[PDB]
Design a binder for these strands. Structure first.
Ligand SMILES: [Mg+2]
Ligand SMILES: [Mg+2]
Ligand SMILES: [Mg+2]
Ligand SMILES: [Mg+2]
Ligand SMILES: [Mg+2]
Ligand SMILES: [Mg+2]
Ligand SMILES: [Mg+2]
Ligand SMILES: [Mg+2]
Ligand SMILES: [Mg+2]
Ligand SMILES: [Mg+2]
Ligand SMILES: [Mg+2]
Ligand SMILES: [Mg+2]
Ligand SMILES: [Mg+2]
Lengths: 63, 86, 190, 97, 62, 139, 143, 139
RNA sequence: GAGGGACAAGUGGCGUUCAGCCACCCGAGAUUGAGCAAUAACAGGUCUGUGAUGCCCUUAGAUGUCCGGGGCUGCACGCGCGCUACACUGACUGGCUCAGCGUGUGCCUACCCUACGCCGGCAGGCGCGGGUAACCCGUUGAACCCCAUUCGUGAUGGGGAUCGGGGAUUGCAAUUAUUCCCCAUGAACGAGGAAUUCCCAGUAAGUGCGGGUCAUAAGCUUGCGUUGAUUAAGUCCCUGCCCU
């Protein structure tokens, strides 16, 4: 059930579209980069955003 | 009140089998001549095979174990496990 | 460095005579341990039930019917008594004849409802070998329990009696009774 | 001389305790730590309905009682100055000599 | 009436009135690649050698 | 080891029958005497409790019956008995076998004189302490 | 070597401790208990006739281990399951007169020191007694 | 020179204090061979009979338990032994022995080193258990 | 208390650039249990929760109000939720042995929890002491379980209702109900027809404790633990729901 919510995918696409540059292919680094470039109210939401951000990075780096 | 019961399964185990509280001398000589020759001695086996009440069975077993003919393997709550040498 | 043994036992060279029950009986060396009572975590995944040792499975199916529910200390005591009975009776290590009773116990074909969405003929189908091990242990403990109900005999004596008369399937045991009864119904619905 | 802070919520408890430690440690006061007494929980369970119709449906109310002890062995003249703090209305203070 | 043994290759699905049965192929070990479709109740993986009491059944479904 | 002693059943208190199962649990068959009063009588008679009823001495039987018919001569204080003090005589006594149903008939007879409703509902087909009788004791 | 009372099998220990109470005769068992007395809430008297020696052995053991107990404390040590019948069972307390009886017996026989806020505790006399008994039961265990 | 590790069974915790010395076992004042269940007076032996001679012969290990239940204490003491060896090897005898003996213990059983997070479920309001409910009533 | 730690992130396979699923390593855990909970309704229930209330009715010989008894309990019956059981995997008797929630007094109007010692067989009593509580009850020495004894297939000692006599204790009062204890009495009941409920892992079930009611007070209910399985991990036949 990783069917992730509209707000999560929305904020994730906004994050990658604004700041592609800081984000890398390392999940634990990208997690802390999300708290620097955004305001996330909760840690579960941080983890969900960062996971789908890394899964988008493994597509954008691909094609 | 009226006696109504919803199931009918009569004819129990064997219809109040009689059992001797005290061993006669013929039964005691039968003990002394073939209770060595059994392979495993429990009070249940001795009771159901020789028509003995279980307390009398435990009395006879604790007798002949004190003779040392029988060999104890273990004892616990409700099971008494025996053998004979050879 | 020691050999992993149950009590006074070897717990070794127990050979399942056929295949179709290998890897569902955990009698092997990587799943042989001292006591049957282990940390039960065997409902997590479907097929990880196979890694339980069959002696623990025999204890688990032995504790039933409310009055005896729980009390794994009591049922491990029962198994400890029963192996001590089978050791004195004919030798031939009780783990081996337990495996032989499991083989010559559970049914190999049954009857069930199949489709076509009409009148159900109770069609004869096969059986999973996991379900053979399960139904084997269930029929063994059921026969032992309702044999030891209301007699001078004990759970230990009736359980050892049921295991020995199931490893020697001479039509006196309740496991061979329900074995033959299920195969006759399957042949009649064949 | 000890001070018992028994409060209604955890955040105001932590804030008044941090203010007390910050107003304590600039002086030469040997301070024992904010020891955490265990949380008492007063529970009330209620039938939820004025008449007994429907599914049996129960409330489950809780309050959390929090408590911190701090020991300040001193002359009581300093403790009179320590007492004067604009304190949050959800916090209760005991002083014991 | 010989008894044959057969090991599972695939799982075609779960069928029955209750969904209890599993239509599967046990292949045949004795000769070349012969495989019939038989019903099994109870859990079954790949690599489960199955005991057959008749190798002449085939109750197929799509 | 006591091989065999020739006894099956005694005649005690002119009405009752003792078997051979034990001594302390076969004196139980006498009315008015149950679980613990026998274990009082047995331990005052100093009998080994392992022995059966079919292995015991008739002199010791008569001594037991003496303990049964009169406890207060030896010991066995007043609180333990069946017939408490305050009676149509005030005697701290133990009721007998045949005397028990007679004392019960005297109880019901003197409650019927008073017409206390305890004895009245006892004479009716009812329960005295049976607080609810919608479902209790049907048929 | 050193043998302490915890280092021995435990029901084996009380089996000899009740005997070495009977050897000395360190007991004041007055009248009613010798007559007949039930336990906490029980139906029969106990079978083993020296059960006051047995209770005294158990009391001596528990006062050696958990010191400072009293009458009601040892009353709750013994532990009551009272099957009331149709109405289900509960934890019922032991009898109080035997609980203070064994205390009065061991106090008169010089095996009870007083913890003054509480009650009974060990004496050095009873320490030597219980300890030599544990040593000889350990020797009987190995032998 | 000593390390204290814990048991963490379900609500049973064994403080295991391992000090250098000849080898002793204090379980609540009482040695190894005397535990409260006679049946599980082999299960707790599994770390000792699995490690062997020169390892307990090198470490003193004493155990203090304020646990929750009989069977829970056995697994708590068991896992406390198996973790006490791990931490005493991290302090005293190097990783080339520690990870190897830890691999032997884990390839035997994971629960000797890994605590299982399985506590109770809270008793739900509708039924008498945590999952079950009362009987409904139709007509 | 602050913070960290778990996201399908890593591998492989199935996948349309996908969405995602399956299997496995590592981890403590590959997700646990709840709470809250939409739009619109029922002619659902409460006027007996209210000084929340319309209208009607009664208001001095009262449908207001006290006060004394009685009663909702009264039994040829049928039905619902449950407790104890039907015994040997057990009862009896002794010994051994480990918990967790949480509760406790001079209170916004009437209120305790118990430690110790001594008397009594038990229920209980009398003096003394503590606790407005991580301080004392209370290292809550619980039951189940475990070891040993006796009982031996017998309506037996399983079963404990029925009921005779007595003794404490609350209370203003227990008798047509208190409650607790002792002795006595010792029934039906042999695992239950038609049918039906509940339940997937610390789960059902055995077992005891704490709270609510209260003075006396649990078989009820609500939380806590303690010992701890079997069989699934699937379908839409039966019951019922959601979308075309
Ligand atoms: Mg049941
Ligand atoms: Mg809604
Ligand atoms: Mg009003
Ligand atoms: Mg009513
Ligand atoms: Mg009815
Ligand atoms: Mg209901
Ligand atoms: Mg009884
Ligand atoms: Mg009877
Ligand atoms: Mg129903
Ligand atoms: Mg029960
Ligand atoms: Mg209550
Ligand atoms: Mg109350
Ligand atoms: Mg109620």
């Amino acid at each position: 059930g990783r069917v992730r919510t509209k707000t999560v995918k929305k904020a994730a696409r906004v994050i990658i579209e604004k700041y592609y540059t800081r984000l890398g292919n390392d999940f634990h680094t990208n997690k802390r980069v999300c708290e620097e470039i955004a305001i996330i109210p909760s840690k579960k939401l941080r983890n969900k955003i960062a996971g789908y951000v890394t899964h988008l990075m493994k597509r954008i780096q691909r094609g | 009140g009226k006696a109504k019961k919803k199931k009918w399964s009569k004819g129990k185990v064997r219809d109040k089998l009689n059992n001797l509280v005290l061993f006669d001398k013929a039964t005691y000589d039968k003990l002394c001549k073939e209770v060595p020759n059994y392979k495993l001695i429990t009070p249940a086996v001795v009771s159901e095979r020789l028509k003995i009440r279980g307390s009398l069975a435990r009395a006879a077993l604790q007798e002949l174990l004190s003779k040392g003919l029988i060999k104890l393997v273990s004892k616990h709550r409700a099971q008494v496990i025996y053998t004979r040498n050879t | 460095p020691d050999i992993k043994l149950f009590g006074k036992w070897s717990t070794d060279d127990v050979q399942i005579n056929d295949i179709s029950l290998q890897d569902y009986i955990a009698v092997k060396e990587k799943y042989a341990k001292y006591l049957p009572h282990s940390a039960g975590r065997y409902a997590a995944k479907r097929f990880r039930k196979a890694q339980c040792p069959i002696v623990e499975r025999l204890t688990n199916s032995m504790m039933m019917h409310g009055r005896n529910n729980g009390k794994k200390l009591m049922t491990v005591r029962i198994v400890k008594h029963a192996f001590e009975i089978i050791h004195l009776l004919t030798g031939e290590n009780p783990l081996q004849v337990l495996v032989n009773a499991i083989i010559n116990s559970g049914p190999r074909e049954d009857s069930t409802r199949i489709g076509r969405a009409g009148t159900v003929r109770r069609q004869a189908v096969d059986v999973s070998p996991l379900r053979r091990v399960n139904q084997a242990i269930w029929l063994l403990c059921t026969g032992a329990r309702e044999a030891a109900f209301r007699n001078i005999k004990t759970i230990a004596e009736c359980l050892a009696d049921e295991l020995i008369n199931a490893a020697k399937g001479s039509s006196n045991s309740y496991a061979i009774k329900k074995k033959d009864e299920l195969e006759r119904v399957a042949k009649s619905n064949r | 001389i000890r001070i018992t802070l028994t409060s209604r919520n955890v955040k105001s408890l932590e804030k008044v305790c941090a203010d007390l430690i910050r107003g304590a440690k600039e002086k030469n006061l040997k301070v024992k730590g904010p020891v955490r007494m265990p949380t008492k929980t007063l529970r009330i369970t209620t039938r939820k309905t004025p008449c007994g119709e429907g599914s049996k449906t129960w409330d489950r109310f809780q309050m959390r009682i929090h408590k911190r002890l701090i020991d300040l062995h001193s002359p009581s003249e300093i403790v009179k100055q320590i007492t004067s703090i604009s304190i949050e209305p959800g916090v209760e203070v005991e002083v014991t000599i | 009436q010989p008894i044959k043994l057969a090991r599972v290759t695939k799982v075609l699905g779960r069928t029955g009135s209750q969904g209890q049965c599993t239509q599967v192929r046990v292949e045949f070990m004795d000769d070349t690649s012969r495989s019939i479709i038989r019903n099994v109740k109870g859990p079954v993986r790949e690599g489960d050698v199955l005991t057959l009491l008749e190798s002449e059944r085939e109750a197929r479904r799509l | 080891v006591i091989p065999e002693k020739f006894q099956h059943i005694l005649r005690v208190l002119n009405t009752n029958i003792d078997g051979r199962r034990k001594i302390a649990f076969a004196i139980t068959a006498i009315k008015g005497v149950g679980r613990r009063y026998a274990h009082v009588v047995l331990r005052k008679a100093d009998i080994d409790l392992t022995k059966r009823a079919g292995e015991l001495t008739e002199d010791e039987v008569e001594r037991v019956i003496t303990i049964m018919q009169n406890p207060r001569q030896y010991k066995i204080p007043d609180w333990f008995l069946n017939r408490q003090k305050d009676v149509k005589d005030g005697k701290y006594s133990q009721v007998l076998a045949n005397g028990l149903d007679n004392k019960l008939r005297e109880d019901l007879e003197r409650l019927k004189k008073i017409r206390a409703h305890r004895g009245l509902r006892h004479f009716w087909g009812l329960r005295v302490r049976g607080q609810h009788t919608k479902t209790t004791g049907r048929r | 070597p050193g043998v302490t009372v915890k280092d021995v099998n435990q029901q084996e220990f009380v089996r000899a401790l009740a005997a070495f109470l009977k050897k000395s005769g360190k007991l004041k068992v007055p009248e009613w208990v010798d007559t007949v007395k039930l336990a906490k809430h029980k139906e029969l008297a106990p079978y083993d006739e020296n059960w006051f020696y047995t209770r005294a052995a158990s009391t001596a053991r528990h006062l050696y281990l958990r010191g400072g107990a009293g009458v009601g404390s040892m009353t709750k040590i013994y532990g009551g399951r009272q099957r009331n019948g149709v109405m289900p069972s509960h934890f019922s307390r032991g009898s109080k007169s035997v609980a203070r009886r064994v205390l009065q017996a061991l106090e008169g026989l010089k095996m009870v020191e007083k913890d003054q806020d509480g009650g009974r505790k060990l004496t050095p006399q009873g320490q030597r007694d219980l300890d030599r008994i544990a040593g000889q039961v350990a020797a009987a265990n190995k032998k | 020179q000593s390390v204290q590790v814990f048991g963490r069974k379900k609500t049973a915790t064994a403080v295991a204090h391992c000090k250098r010395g000849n080898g002793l076992i204090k379980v609540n004042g009482r040695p190894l061979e005397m535990i409260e269940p006679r049946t599980l007076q082999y299960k707790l032996l599994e770390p000792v009979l699995l490690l062997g001679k020169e390892r307990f012969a090198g470490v003193d290990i004493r155990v203090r338990v304020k646990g929750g239940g009989h069977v829970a204490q056995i697994y708590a003491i068991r896992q406390s032994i198996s973790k006490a060896l791990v931490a005493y090897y991290q302090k005293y005898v190097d990783e080339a022995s520690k990870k190897e003996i830890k691999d032997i213990l884990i390839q035997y059983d994971r629960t000797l080193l890994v605590a299982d997070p399985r506590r109770c479920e809270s008793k739900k309001f509708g039924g008498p258990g945590a999952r079950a409910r009362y009987q409904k009533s139709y007509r």
